[PDB]
Amino acid sequence: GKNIQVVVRCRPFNLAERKASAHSIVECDPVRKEVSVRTGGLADKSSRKTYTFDMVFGASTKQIDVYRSVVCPILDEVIMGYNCTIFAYGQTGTGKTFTMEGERSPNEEYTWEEDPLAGIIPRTLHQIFEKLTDNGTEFSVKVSLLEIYNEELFDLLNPSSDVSERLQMFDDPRNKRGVIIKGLEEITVHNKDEVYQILEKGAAKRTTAATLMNAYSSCSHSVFSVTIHMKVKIGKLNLVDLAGSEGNINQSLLTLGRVITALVERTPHVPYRESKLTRILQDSLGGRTRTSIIATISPASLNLEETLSTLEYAHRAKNILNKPEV
Ligand SMILES: Nc1ncnc2c1ncn2[C@@H]1O[C@H](COP(=O)(O)OP(=O)(O)O)[C@@H](O)[C@H]1O
């Protein structure tokens, strides 16, 4: 048992992976919490090497079923007054954005229930207003969205400053192992339905940067921060949508791995300082908290080598052995 959690969410076959008639190699066992892969294709060889994690979500896994298993325990700790972080790992296209951001699916006006395709970000905000309005707590909710492209920090929330100013950041004398992002826009949310309008602003700004600087989302980290003031508790929840797993980006992810590895093994000299991403979330990983990681993979034999790497990263972060009968 640990405060660090590592789960794996496989994705179905997309039409493109179908269009080339690729065939699955990923086996998801949620009960045993295992996920296995093969090696040969038409050879149908005996390829063991099965992995075990804290939880496993198969191809039929639904969005709500991920929020309940992964986010609900963490949100309660945030409302209690702690800082937390949720991560999404994996090859571009596996489903980090579909898991962290969700969709809407053309169906028009939605009442007050969550969209079935919504992600962690839609659900977390709406559950924040519901749970804190129900227990009559006085609260204020403000969110922030920056983007780490090539290790320079960009705000996707500011309406002004249309191009791209690398935000400056320095350790604030106020709390150590903490930092302050000068100039970072902090949009204050009033209604729970406001979160959908904020994902629109940042989307274009992420697109405007993707076209006028080659700041494609696939090659950048996405940090969503929601802070909750309550009465006197302050809670923060960081939802990080990491860049695709596969000279400077491949270092920030390996740094984050070194951290979580160091966080799981109680080891000293965890090098938060080795990257901008780990330095920002330092106040969310050092101070004892609940950290969760979601590694998204593809079931096609097309992406065999990357699906193995991603699972390999997850094993390195929190190593747990496979138990009897693999
Ligand atoms: N669990 C899922 N259910 C349905 N569609 C999914 C799922 N995961 C991914 N997708 C689909 O795959 C794409 C989402 O990939 P994306 O989130 O961009 O990966 P990444 O964010 O890691 O680059 C979309 O085409 C979406 O339709």
Ligand SMILES: [Mg+2]
């Ligand atoms: Mg994406």
